[PDB]
Amino acid sequence: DNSSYFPVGQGPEINDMATWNGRLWMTTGNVQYLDYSGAAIVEAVPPAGE
Amino acid sequence: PISADFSEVENAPSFLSLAENTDEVLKPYTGLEIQTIITNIVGDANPNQSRIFDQDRLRGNQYSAGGLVTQNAVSAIPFTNLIPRTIRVGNILVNSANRLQITETNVSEYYSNPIIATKLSEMISDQVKNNQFSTWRRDNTSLQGFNAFDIATINTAILPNGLSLESMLLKLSLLHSIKAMNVDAASINRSQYQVIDHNTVPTIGAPAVVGVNNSPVFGEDCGGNNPVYPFGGGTGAIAFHVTLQTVPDERKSYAIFVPPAILQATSDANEALALFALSMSEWPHALYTVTKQTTDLAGANAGQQVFIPTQSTIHIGGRRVLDLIIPRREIAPNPTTLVAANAMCMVRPQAGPDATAGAIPLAAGQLFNMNFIGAPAFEEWPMTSYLYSWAGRFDITTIRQYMGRLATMVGVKDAYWAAHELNVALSQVAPKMTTAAGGWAAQAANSAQQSDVCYSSLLTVTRSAANFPLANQPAADMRVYDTDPATWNKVALGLATAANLVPEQSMDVPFVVGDARASFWERLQAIPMCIAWTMYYHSRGITTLAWDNAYTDNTNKWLQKMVRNTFSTTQSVGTIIPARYGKIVCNLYKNMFHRAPAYVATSVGGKELHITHFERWLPGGTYANVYSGAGAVVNCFSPVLIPDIWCQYFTAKLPLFAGAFPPAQGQNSTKGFNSKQGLMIHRNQNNNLVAPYLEKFADNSSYFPVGQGPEINDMATWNGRLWMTTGNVQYLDYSGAAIVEAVPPAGELPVGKQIPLLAGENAPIELTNAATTCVPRYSNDGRRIFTYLTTAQSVIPVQACNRAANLARSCWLLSNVYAEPALQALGDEVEDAFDTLTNSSFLDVAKSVAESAGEVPATKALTDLQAVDVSSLPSTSDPSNVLSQPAPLMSPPT
Amino acid sequence: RIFDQDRLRGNQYSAGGLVTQNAVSAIPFTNLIPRTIRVGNILVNSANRL
Amino acid sequence: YFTAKLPLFAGAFPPAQGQNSTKGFNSKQGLMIHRNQNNNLVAPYLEKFA
User: Fold this and answer.
1) Strand partners, C12
2) Which of B789, B781, B773, B788 is CA-nearest to residue B541?
3) How many angstroms separate the CA atoms of B599 and B421, rounded?
4) Distance (Å) from the C-alpha of residue A5 to the closest C-alpha of chain B?
5) What CA–CA distance (Å, rounded) separates C25 from C7?
6) CB B285 within 8 Å of CB B314
């Protein structure tokens, strides 16, 4: 129940293997930081691949 | 609950059964009981994702008396706090013609849980006594950055009462309730803007703006950029002191310390100081405003409406001027020079980010010039202007952390929750009803009747009679506790403690304090209060004009008692005592909702008693009454505020006379009670008037005997509702004469407020949105009132009482559900993984602090060793004890 | 006032699902015989034998 | 109307009877509501794998 907005008072859970996979996606040269619908998030983002 | 068949209404509980004392423990009413019924959100959801902007109505299918079904029928949530100062008129937004609402509080000292001096105080007295052997004036007694001569004078002459903290927590809760409007429009109800202005439509996209002193009309701006108190009309004064010596003699006794434990955040602490100063000066310091974009019902014309929060107009009296005594950064000799002072103040106060005009003008961010001995001149600021500047800077999320540190010093859980109960009780408000035949009505735009409003207690809210600042004070509406500066100073420095003051964790702060949903949730907490007060006033038949004159009248001895006992105007042993019949309403609440109201203790001679907000109202107000469709007043009904579907769909258990009319099912529809129930029909000299089966005493009292009034009897009241719900009742004397009270145009009943519809909604039909239970029985001059029908009109209903005929009625098509309580704690909280990684350490360090109130690692056994003459230490000859109440024994005869 | 107590009264349910409130029916019997009948709003002599 | 026995998802909607008309299954049945980034779309209780 945390798929697009986290439920109030809760945040992401520790899970190593998922973080490992996230590093695998990042270490490719063209990662894209978006949300569940595929829209932009409010944080500033690196020029692509940095 | 809604009834399914006549078998269910016939087996409903009697009123006396629900008013019995109940002994069991019960959970607090968080308002989420109503949320899971009128909303998509069962269980949790993020407020952003839920759009509770559209979750602001009761919805359902309705069944008509004629057999048709009206799908997607609707009803407004009755309560609000916003007051329009600019009403839409003729599709064009314009200035309000009517003066603003006001409220008054009776603040005072009362005995609280008994208080006792701490070990730290004993150590201080021993330090002084030991110091007396040496001709050295020395500063052993300094604590937390305060002067040694100050800790000595804060350690003297304790007051028995106890400590409250309640008025402090009121001011904080009112402020929070106002800043909670500042969040995005997606999570405030649409209806909340249109309870009083039914011709406007708010826009979802843009958040509301919270300003100060902006109002167009009746001088509501309190001097604008140059401010004054809205009520007194004056201007305050505030001064900061490193030490108590620089305080002028006229007011060295009223000084308050500002403990270092607040301001410990690396978050701006100059603001936390301002919010400590705000919570002890007089409230309101200015009239807050909520400006919101809105549009015409056609969507055509757009504008910025102005609103006044109901929290911003209630007067909690107190202190115009303050001396705030700031902690010292570095232990040191008292700063005879200035640079020794400023570079050693733990915080150096400065004005907030807003400019002000008038005498002593303040540029934004201006710095206060510190007070110290031998200074060239004394310096102070007006406090209305000092508070005007920070007024835009507070917000919900910072109040949450503030109160989170405040909780660490003193427990604030139960006290805050009770203060929040007072908040809801005094701020939520609803417009008076319009009589009609059908399901909707509203008063003419920008009329005096449109804006007239009432409390959850069915008492009307008073209006101002002249432009602000008000020249003269209104009567008190309710009485609250006060917070003594003296024992505050004692408690903040660990020198004193009480069982209600035990320190708590920052996580214990109740959920409303943080959330953006809090406005909606306050809106939902006032309904059960009206349900309780409504069942109370409707159990007896007394009319509005009759309550209105009751306190004084000499026509009947019973009526004077019946009002004198509902208000809190009694005392014993120097403390407040709860109203005698407020306990009935409290019991009635506990029995219907299976939830316990928040309470606070009063110590009568050391015996604690619980006061609830049901028991602390004061006499003076007019009672709630409906208006005609033309605007003429109607006196004849008992007091009413809300449609009875609210009363009957949200209670776990209910009184019999108030149950819903059952659905048509084949042959059966509705039915009435007869002589087999102990009842009997009234007849008079006229042969064309018929009154229902009623009590047998009804035969022998055209006038009630003095010392006596109408008695509870559910079934006769039910029959009275059956006569009323036909479209053509007649309200008359035992003889068929007209009563003195003003009566509705024929066949009309009070009905709930109209609001604009969304696509797919339908308006409520017939009596689906009316009040029905308000059956008059006691006239102003002591007569009974009878509901009559003509003979031919009378035949079907009487047979319905005899169970030989059926009467058609409308109903909601809604089933019954009532949840077990959603949360025990009164605070939301969830383990994170780190909470589990670091569990036990927190669990015992917590308990090791809760017992550690007023403790230090040095014990008397160590500090004895350093003493010169141990036998003469006062801690030896005076072991400390809890002070008794009203006062500790003195001068005993040996 | 049993002058007005001269009918069967009650609610009726239709085959189409509507409810007709305050529906009525006459008490069938009598003994009085008019010898002057109202006709055209104007009262006139009876045409029929006793 | 012509089967001796039938699958549950295909049964007829029940007749109105006094208060009751038709009703739906919830989390007590093992189901749960779908929500997305949009705040103005709601989907029924469905499977948990949904």
Assistant:
1) C20
2) B773
3) 9
4) 7
5) 6
6) no
Q: Reduced to 3 states, what is the DSSP secondary structure of residue B194?
A: coil
Strands B103-108 and B430-431: unpaired
Buried b (16+ CB within 10 A) or exposed e, B555-577: bbebbeebbbebbbeeeeebbbb
Q: How far B724 CA lies from chain C's nearest CA (Å)?
A: 16
Chain A residue with Cα closest to B828: A9
DSSP string, B336-372: SSHHHHHTTBSS--B--S--B-SSS-B-TTPBP--B-
Residue with tokens 């904080």: B172
> Please, is B382 exposed, middle or buried when counting C-beta atoms within 10 Å of its C-beta (0-12, 13-18, 19+)?
buried
Of B67, B58, B32, B15, nearest to B654 (Cα)?
Answer: B15
* Cβ–Cβ below 8 Å for B40 and D39: no
- Cα–Cα–Cα angle for D41, D47, D50, nearest 5°? 60
Nominal resolution (angstroms): 3.0
Q: Are B78 and B199 in contact (CB under 8 A)?
A: no
Decide: helix, strand or coil at residue B251: helix
Question: Could you tell me the CA-to-CA distances from B299 to B92, B199, B290, B806 in Å, in that order?
Answer: 12, 11, 21, 47
CA distance B711 to B14: 13
Helix axis angle for B714-725 and B791-801, nearest 10°, is 140
Size of interface B-C (CB pairs under 8 A): 33
How far apart CA B678 and CA B146 sit, in angstroms, is: 77
- Alpha helices, H only, B690-779: 714-725
Q: Which residues of C fall within a CB distance of 8 Å from B664?
A: 19
Backbone dihedral angles phi then psi of residue B847, each to the nearest 5 degrees: -65, -30
Bridge partners, B316 (sequence order): B283
* H or E element that contains B535: helix B527-539
Indicate which technique resolved this structure: cryo-EM
Give the integer Cα–Cα distance in Å for B399 and B265.
Answer: 13
d(CA B261, CA B332): 20
Q: Give me Rg for the CA atoms of chain A.
A: 13
Rounded to the nearest angstrom, the gap between the alpha carbon of residue B253 and the centroid of all alpha carbons in its chain is 32
Instruction: With H, G, I as helix, E, B as strand and everything else as coil, classify residue B240.
Output: strand
Nearest CA-CA distance, residue A37 and chain D, Å: 7
Partners of B47 on chain A (C-beta within 8 Å) are 8
| Chain-chain contact of B833 with A9 (C-beta, under 8 angstroms) | no
Which phi and psi angles does B387 have, rounded to 5°?
Answer: -85, -20
Q: What is the dihedral of CA B790, B795, B796, B801, to 10 degrees?
A: 100
A12 Cβ under 8 Å from any chain B Cβ: no
Q: Which two tokens stand for residue B526?
A: 């006032």
* Residue-by-residue DSSP string for B590-629: HHHHS-PPP-EEEEETTEEEEE-GGG-B-S-PPBP--B-T
Q: In sequence order, which ranges of B329-484 are alpha helices (DSSP H)?
A: 338-342, 383-390, 396-409, 413-427, 448-451
- Contacting residues of B for C22, CB less than 8 Å apart: 796
Alpha-carbon distances, residue B800 vs B10, B353, B569, B719, B883 (angstroms): 14, 72, 47, 10, 67
Chains that touch D (3 or more CB pairs under 8 A): A, B
What sign does the CA torsion over B766, B770, B772, B778 have? negative
- Contact with chain D for residue A34, Cβ under 8 A: no
| Alpha carbon B452 to its chain's center | 19
**B163 contact partners, CB below 8 Å, separation of at least 6:** B112, B115, B483, B484, B487, B488, B491, B496, B498, B500, B501
Residues B600-631: b if buried by 16+ CB within 10 A, e if exposed: bbbbbeeeeeebbbbbbbbbebebbbbbbbee
Q: First CA to last CA across chain A, in angstroms?
A: 32
What distance in Å separates residue B842's CA from the closest CA in chain D? Answer: 35
Contact by Cβ (8 Å): B382, B234: no
